């Protein structure tokens, strides 16, 4: 069991348990600890009701996005293993399991990493992929091989050293890793790649064409 899960157990036993269920939505009950980091004025760890909207969480506790809410570009809601979401989705999304599943990202560890419009989002996703490459245990074939493969592909993507077709290739590579590994580290390495491809494909193609005509 997780430390947070274990820690709340005595409070749940004492105060009632039915008191715990009074917070958040149905099947999304209780209170949660959130870690807001990245491009925010006041990065911090806070405690909040489970089903709080993401925008209210960022504005009230973290002091808002750097440069205002209009400067928001992307949010990873639940740690690096969860797919990212753009600003158009963060406007009304709720910070619980089911709502974030409906947004195709999942809640995860409730660690909100905020990136504004001045960041190289491809570089950030590549850094996450490199983290997963360095943290793979190498036991099983899909993780041990495909994560390093995706790491090389994303390194080439950052410089634009690829062609647009490879984007689809990368997608399929991730699909060959997800659901086929022993543990969920392969899934958590494939998911950010899928989120980046799903929401920021034009950025990839623009970088590719810039590299193409820059190098003839």
């Amino acid at each position: 069991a997780n430390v947070e899960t274990v820690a709340v157990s005595p409070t749940i036993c004492r105060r009632g348990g039915a008191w715990f269920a009074s917070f958040g939505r149905e099947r999304n009950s209780g209170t949660k600890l959130f870690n807001i980091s990245g491009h925010v004025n006041h990065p911090c760890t806070v405690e909040e009701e489970m089903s709080v909207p993401l925008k209210e969480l960022i504005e009230k506790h973290a002091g808002g996005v750097i440069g205002g809410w209009d400067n928001l570009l992307a949010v990873i809601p639940g740690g690096s293993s969860t797919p990212l979401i753009p600003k158009s989705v963060c406007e009304t999304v709720l910070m619980d399991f089911d709502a974030l599943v409906q947004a195709q990202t999942g809640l995860g560890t409730a660690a909100v990493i905020v990136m504004d419009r001045s960041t190289d989002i491809v570089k950030a996703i590549a850094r996450l992929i490199e983290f997963y490459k360095h943290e793979s245990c190498g036991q099983c074939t899909p993780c041990r091989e495909g994560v390093d493969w995706m790491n090389k592909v994303m390194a080439r993507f950052v410089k634009g050293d690829a062609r647009p077709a490879e984007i689809d290739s990368l997608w399929e590579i991730s699909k060959q890793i997800e659901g086929h590994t022993i543990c969920a580290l392969g899934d958590g390495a494939a998911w950010p790649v899928q989120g980046l491809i799903r929401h920021f494909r034009p950025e990839l193609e623009e970088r590719m064409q810039q590299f193409a005509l820059q190098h003839q």
């Binding site: 077709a165 490879e166 689809d168 997608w171 399929e172």
Partner: protein, 56 residues
Amino acid sequence: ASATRVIQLLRNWASGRDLQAKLQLRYQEISKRTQPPPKLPVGPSHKLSNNYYCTR
């Protein structure tokens, strides 16, 4: 060919047709024996994605 004109007339009369139009020997209208390199395109299955072997 290098045949004399009178010999060409005699050949044309004997055969009944114009021989110099269609010579059996090849002088210069053939392809050069040194050619530029080709490029040789690839087949339909040379895609990078949506190319699973079980579908083809």
